[PDB]
Amino acid sequence: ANFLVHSSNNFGAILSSTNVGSNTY
Amino acid sequence: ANFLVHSSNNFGAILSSTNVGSNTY
Amino acid sequence: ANFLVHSSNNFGAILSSTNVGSNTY
Amino acid sequence: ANFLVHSSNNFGAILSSTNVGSNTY
Amino acid sequence: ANFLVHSSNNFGAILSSTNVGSNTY
Amino acid sequence: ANFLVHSSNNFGAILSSTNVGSNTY
Amino acid sequence: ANFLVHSSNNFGAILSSTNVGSNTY
Amino acid sequence: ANFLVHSSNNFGAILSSTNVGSNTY
Amino acid sequence: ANFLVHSSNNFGAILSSTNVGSNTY
Amino acid sequence: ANFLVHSSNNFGAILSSTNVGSNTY
Amino acid sequence: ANFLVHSSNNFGAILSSTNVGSNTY
Amino acid sequence: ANFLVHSSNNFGAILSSTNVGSNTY
Amino acid sequence: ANFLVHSSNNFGAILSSTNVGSNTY
Amino acid sequence: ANFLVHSSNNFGAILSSTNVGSNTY
Amino acid sequence: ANFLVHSSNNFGAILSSTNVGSNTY
Amino acid sequence: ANFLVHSSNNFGAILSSTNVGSNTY
Numbered sequence: 001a002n003f004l005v006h007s008s009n010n011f012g013a014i015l016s017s018t019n020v021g022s023n024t025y
Numbered sequence: 026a027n028f029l030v031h032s033s034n035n036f037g038a039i040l041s042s043t044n045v046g047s048n049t050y
Numbered sequence: 051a052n053f054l055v056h057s058s059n060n061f062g063a064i065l066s067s068t069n070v071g072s073n074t075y
Numbered sequence: 076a077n078f079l080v081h082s083s084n085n086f087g088a089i090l091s092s093t094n095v096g097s098n099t100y
Numbered sequence: 101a102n103f104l105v106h107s108s109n110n111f112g113a114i115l116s117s118t119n120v121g122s123n124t125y
Numbered sequence: 126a127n128f129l130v131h132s133s134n135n136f137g138a139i140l141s142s143t144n145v146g147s148n149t150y
Numbered sequence: 151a152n153f154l155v156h157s158s159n160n161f162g163a164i165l166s167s168t169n170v171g172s173n174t175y
Numbered sequence: 176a177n178f179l180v181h182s183s184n185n186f187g188a189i190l191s192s193t194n195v196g197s198n199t200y
Numbered sequence: 201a202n203f204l205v206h207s208s209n210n211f212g213a214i215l216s217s218t219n220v221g222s223n224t225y
Numbered sequence: 226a227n228f229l230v231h232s233s234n235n236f237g238a239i240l241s242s243t244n245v246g247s248n249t250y
Numbered sequence: 251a252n253f254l255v256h257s258s259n260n261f262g263a264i265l266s267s268t269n270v271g272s273n274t275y
Numbered sequence: 276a277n278f279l280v281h282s283s284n285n286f287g288a289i290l291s292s293t294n295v296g297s298n299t300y
Numbered sequence: 301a302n303f304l305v306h307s308s309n310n311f312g313a314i315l316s317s318t319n320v321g322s323n324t325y
Numbered sequence: 326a327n328f329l330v331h332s333s334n335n336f337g338a339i340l341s342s343t344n345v346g347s348n349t350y
Numbered sequence: 351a352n353f354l355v356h357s358s359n360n361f362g363a364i365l366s367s368t369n370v371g372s373n374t375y
Numbered sequence: 376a377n378f379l380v381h382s383s384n385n386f387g388a389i390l391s392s393t394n395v396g397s398n399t400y
C-alpha cells in the first residue's frame with residue numbers, strides 16, 4: 001500500500017486507512 | 026490500496042477508508 | 051509500503067495506516 | 076518500506092504505519 | 101527500510117513504523 | 126536500514142522504527 | 151545501518167531503531 | 176555501522192540502535 | 201474572557217477567538 | 226481569563242485564545 | 251487566569267492562551 | 276494562576292499559557 | 301500558582317505556563 | 326507554588342512553570 | 351514550594367519550575 | 376521546600392527547582 005498526501009495548515013482531520021478487523025475512534 | 030490526497034487549509038473533515046468489520050466514530 | 055507526506059503547520063490529525071487486525075484509538 | 080515525511084511546526088498528530096496484528100493507541 | 105524525516109518545532113507526535121506483530125501505545 | 130532525521134526544538138515525540146516481533150510503549 | 155541525526159534543544163523523544171525480536175519501552 | 180549525531184542541550188532522549196535479539200528499556 | 205467548550209470526537213475544526221490586530225491562518 | 230474545556234478523542238483542532246496584537250498560524 | 255482541561259487520546263491540537271503582544275506559530 | 280489538566284495518551288499538542296509580551300513557537 | 305497534571309503515555313506536547321516577558325520556543 | 330504531576334511513559338514534553346522575566350527554549 | 355512527581359520510563363522531558371528572573375534552556 | 380519524586384528508568388530529563396535570580400542551562 002502506498003501513502004502520498006500533501007497538506008498545508010489543515011485544521012481538519014485527514015483519515016486514510018484500511019482495516020480488516022474492528023476499529024474504534 | 027493507494028492513498029493520494031491534496032488538501033489546503035481544510036476546516037472540514039476528510040474521511041477515506043475501507044473497513045471489513047465494525048467501526049465507530 | 052511507501053510513506054511520503056508533506057505537511058506544514060497542521061493543527062489537524064493526519065492518519066494513514068494499514069491494519070490487518072483489531073486497532074483502537 | 077520507505078519513510079519520507081516533511082513537517083514544519085505541526086501541532087497535530089501524524090500517524091503512518093503498517094500493522095499485521097492488533098495495535099492499541 | 102529507509103528513514104528520512106525533516107521536522108522543525110513540532111508539538112505534535114510523528115509516528116512512522118512497520119510492525120509485523122502486536123504493538124501497544 | 127538508513128536513518129536520517131533533521132529536528133529543531135521538537136516538543137513532540139518522533140518515532141521511526143521497524144519491529145518484526147511484539148513491542149510495547 | 152547508517153545513523154545521521156541533527157537535533158537542537160529537543161524536549162521531545164526521538165526514537166529510531168530496528169528490532170528483529172521483542173522489545174519493551 | 177556508522178554513527179554521526181549532532182546534539183545541543185537536548186532534554187529529550189535520543190535513541191538510535193539496531194537489535195537482532197530481544198531488548199528491554 | 202471566559203472559555204467553556206464541550207466537544208466529543210470532533211473531526212471538524214473549532215475556532216473561537218478575539219483578535220484586535222491582523223491574524224493569519 | 227478562565228479556560229475550561231472538555232474534549233474526548235478529538236481529531237480536529239480546537240483553538241481558543243485572545244490576541245491583542247498580530248498573530249500567525 | 252485559571253486553566254482546567256480534560257482530554258483523552260486527542261490527535262488534534264488544543265490551543266488556549268491569551269497574548270498581549272505578537273505571537274507566531 | 277491555577278493549572279489543572281487531565282490527559283491520557285494524547286498524540287496532539289496541548290497548549291495553555293498567558294503571555295504578556297511577544298512569544299514564538 | 302498551583303500545578304496539577306495527570307498524563308499517561310502522551311506522545312504530544314503539554315505546555316502550561318505564565319510568562320510576563322518575552323519567551324521563545 | 327505546588328507541583329503535583331503523574332506521568333507514565335511520556336514520549337512528549339511536559340512543561341509547567343511560571344516566569345516573571347524573559348525565558349528562552 | 352512543594353514538589354511531588356511520579357514518573358515511570360519517561361523518554362520525554364518533564365520541566366516544572368518557577369523563575370523570577372531570566373532563564374535560558 | 377519539600378522534594379519527593381519517584382522515578383524508574385527515565386531516559387528523559389526531570390527538572391524541578393525554584394530560582395529567584397538568573398539561571399542558565
Ligand SMILES: [N]
Binds near residue numbers: 025075209
Ligand atoms: N475515538
Ligand SMILES: [N]
Binds near residue numbers: 025050
Ligand atoms: N466517534
Ligand SMILES: [N]
Binds near residue numbers: 025074075100234259
Ligand atoms: N483512542
Ligand SMILES: [N]
Binds near residue numbers: 075259284
Ligand atoms: N492509546
Ligand SMILES: [N]
Binds near residue numbers: 099
Ligand atoms: N501507549
Ligand SMILES: [N]
Binds near residue numbers: 150175
Ligand atoms: N509505553
Ligand SMILES: [N]
Binds near residue numbers: 175
Ligand atoms: N518502557
Ligand SMILES: [N]
Binds near residue numbers: 175199200359384
Ligand atoms: N527500561
Ligand SMILES: [N]
Binds near residue numbers: 034224225250
Ligand atoms: N493558515
Ligand SMILES: [N]
Binds near residue numbers: 275
Ligand atoms: N501557521
Ligand SMILES: [N]
Binds near residue numbers: 059084275
Ligand atoms: N508556527
Ligand SMILES: [N]
Binds near residue numbers: 084
Ligand atoms: N516554534
Ligand SMILES: [N]
Binds near residue numbers: 300325
Ligand atoms: N523553540
Ligand SMILES: [N]
Binds near residue numbers: 134324325349350375
Ligand atoms: N530552546
Ligand SMILES: [N]
Binds near residue numbers: 159375
Ligand atoms: N538550553
Ligand SMILES: [N]
Binds near residue numbers: 184375399400
Ligand atoms: N545549559
